[PDB]
Amino acid sequence: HNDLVQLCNPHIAAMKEDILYHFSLSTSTHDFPAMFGDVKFVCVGGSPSRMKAFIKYVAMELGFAHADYPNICEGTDRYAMFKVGPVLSVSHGMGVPSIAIMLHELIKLLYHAHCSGVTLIRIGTSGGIGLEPGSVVITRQAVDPCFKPEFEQIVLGKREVRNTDLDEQLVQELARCSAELGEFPTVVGNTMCTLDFYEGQGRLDGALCSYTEKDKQDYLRAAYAAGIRNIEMEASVFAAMCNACGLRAAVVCVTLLNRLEGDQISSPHDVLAEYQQRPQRLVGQFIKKRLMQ
Amino acid sequence: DLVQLCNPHIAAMKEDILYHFSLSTSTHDFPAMFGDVKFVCVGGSPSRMKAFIKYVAMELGFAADYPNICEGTDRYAMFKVGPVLSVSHGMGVPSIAIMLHELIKLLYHAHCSGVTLIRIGTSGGIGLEPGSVVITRQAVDPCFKPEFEQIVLGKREVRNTDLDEQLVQELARCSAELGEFPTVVGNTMCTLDFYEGQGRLDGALCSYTEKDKQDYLRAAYAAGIRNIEMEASVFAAMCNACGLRAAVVCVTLLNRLEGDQISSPHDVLAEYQQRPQRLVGQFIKKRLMQ
Ligand SMILES: OC[C@H]1OC=C(O)[C@@H]1O
Ligand SMILES: OC[C@H]1OC=C(O)[C@@H]1O
Ligand SMILES: O=c1cc[nH]c(=O)[nH]1
Numbered sequence A: 001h002n003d004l005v006q007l008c009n010p011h012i013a014a015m016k017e018d019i020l021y022h023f024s025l026s027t028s029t030h031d032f033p034a035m036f037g038d039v040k041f042v043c044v045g046g047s048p049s050r051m052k053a054f055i056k057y058v059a060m061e062l063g064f065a066h067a068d069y070p071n072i073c074e075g076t077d078r079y080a081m082f083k084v085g086p087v088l089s090v091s092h093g094m095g096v097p098s099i100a101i102m103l104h105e106l107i108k109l110l111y112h113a114h115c116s117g118v119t120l121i122r123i124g125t126s127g128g129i130g131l132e133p134g135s136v137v138i139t140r141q142a143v144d145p146c147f148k149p150e151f152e153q154i155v156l157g158k159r160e161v162r163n164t165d166l167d168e169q170l171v172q173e174l175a176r177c178s179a180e181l182g183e184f185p186t187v188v189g190n191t192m193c194t195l196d197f198y199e200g201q202g203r204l205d206g207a208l209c210s211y212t213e214k215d216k217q218d219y220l221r222a223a224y225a226a227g228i229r230n231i232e233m234e235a236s237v238f239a240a241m242c243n244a245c246g247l248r249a250a251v252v253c254v255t256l257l258n259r260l261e262g263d264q265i266s267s268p269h270d271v272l273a274e275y276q277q278r279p280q281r282l283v284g285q286f287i288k289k290r291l292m293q
Numbered sequence B: 001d002l003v004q005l006c007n008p009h010i011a012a013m014k015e016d017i018l019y020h021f022s023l024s025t026s027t028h029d030f031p032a033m034f035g036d037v038k039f040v041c042v043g044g045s046p047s048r049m050k051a052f053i054k055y056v057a058m059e060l061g062f063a064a065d066y067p068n069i070c071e072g073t074d075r076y077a078m079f080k081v082g083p084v085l086s087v088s089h090g091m092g093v094p095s096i097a098i099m100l101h102e103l104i105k106l107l108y109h110a111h112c113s114g115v116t117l118i119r120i121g122t123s124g125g126i127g128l129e130p131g132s133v134v135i136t137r138q139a140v141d142p143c144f145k146p147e148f149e150q151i152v153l154g155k156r157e158v159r160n161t162d163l164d165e166q167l168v169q170e171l172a173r174c175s176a177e178l179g180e181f182p183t184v185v186g187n188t189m190c191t192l193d194f195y196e197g198q199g200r201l202d203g204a205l206c207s208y209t210e211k212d213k214q215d216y217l218r219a220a221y222a223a224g225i226r227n228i229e230m231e232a233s234v235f236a237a238m239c240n241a242c243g244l245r246a247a248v249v250c251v252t253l254l255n256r257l258e259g260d261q262i263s264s265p266h267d268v269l270a271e272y273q274q275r276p277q278r279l280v281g282q283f284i285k286k287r288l289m290q
């Protein structure tokens, strides 16, 4: 069996209209069950153009392809959204707050639509620690800059923390899917999530920096010793909010560089373009597998 | 004054790749592209920032193709006309912080001088009429302190988030000259979440009451806060650190004491969003007349 999407907010049922402002969708203008009722896989990532390329790629893999892929979030440019069969693809911009806004409105969307048995997967990019560039990491545990699996949020002025573990069975399944493709290195490790790409990640190439190469190396190697294999900027809220609503979720990111060797992203454009298809291919394999059952 | 960085590592680099702009010192001529920039205007939405650069062109008599300088990426958009640069920054502290780091280095590479940085945005008001414009006197955290906190190599650091006082008063005068919409100077609270982070009852998560919301928002008002958004604190912190003259100008889309949902008709909201554009348009026109 597969359970209905639940909220942790009793106010929503008591509203006569729910406006999904950042999607330009509303319960009074759109039929959510008709539009989204059959959704089973929701994939999210930073870049709208990557999330569109993803929907097209998955359409081909599941035999839906010919055709046009309309942006469901016409009426806004905050996020883009696409659908083919049971697969929904949504962009989320960059950063904890940007993906958090998307998650609130998306979980409400799935709830209004009465979706059931859903899986949510982030596909993204990151910096690796001690891994060859282009390696894919499947996140076991999302982790803060001090290495603790917690997400802190200020609510009405008070600090609140939620656990940021991810579903273990899902990560092992994702690892098997990657083994089946046999196309690129894929590890499971912890993922550090930060609020800043530059100083927040120990970079020396920001507009501000008051530390040395030695300080960076020491911090990064300490992170590695604590089991961290990559660094990005969304994993923490994603995990916390999915945990909060009882949703099975996973995070799959390609590394664009090895941070023990540098800060700048200088690989040729063709190499980066291909690196970024790796998570798509992995998740594509996962979805195809699930559908042949 | 020339734009300055607080990072000694930059000077010794062979090339500087501005990854999220898809710009690089070795593929792009920064002095030739941006050397004459004096006014940098930043906002969340790529559409709004494009409309802004068009509006500005007309008001300064440049008016008709306006190329996205950041073709090659879709992370941010960027437009230029004369001494005015229009840049989008997405939503949230980390999104605008990535943008700022790279924008400030860009201005340094172009060796721009006497620049002004202004965020034109949207926000939720507290105790103000929807459509009111707020000029940020001081950016403040969700406990109403003028501090921005960042974790660097695992350690907590804080910077002050005051904004240039002569600039806020100059902007107030520009709005008075327009005479088109209510404009107040007040404090602006910056949060890391739009829903629970701002005391909304309409998120996917909410374990508090309408009454809890009211008393939090009213305490905020009592501490001099007039609007709520998601960028002001880092913006002020980084500009302060680099010695840049900066301001924050946001229209209010609703009064949060009356509600959480943004339910005004599309046409009203579009007109609201032009208000900060027009004010900043006034400011630029005057700086250029003098
Ligand atoms: O360029 C930074 C983006 O890549 C991975 C993330 O988590 C950020 O959104
Ligand atoms: O819709 C939320 C956006 O409006 C103002 C901000 O600061 C956010 O980026
Ligand atoms: O080093 C990196 C690369 C991509 N995304 C990140 O957040 N960090």
Ligand SMILES: O=c1cc[nH]c(=O)[nH]1
Residues within 6 Å of the ligand: B122, B123, B124, B125, B194, B198, B228, B229, B230, B253
């Ligand atoms: O209420 C609001 C409206 C726009 N932007 C915000 O951060 N809050």
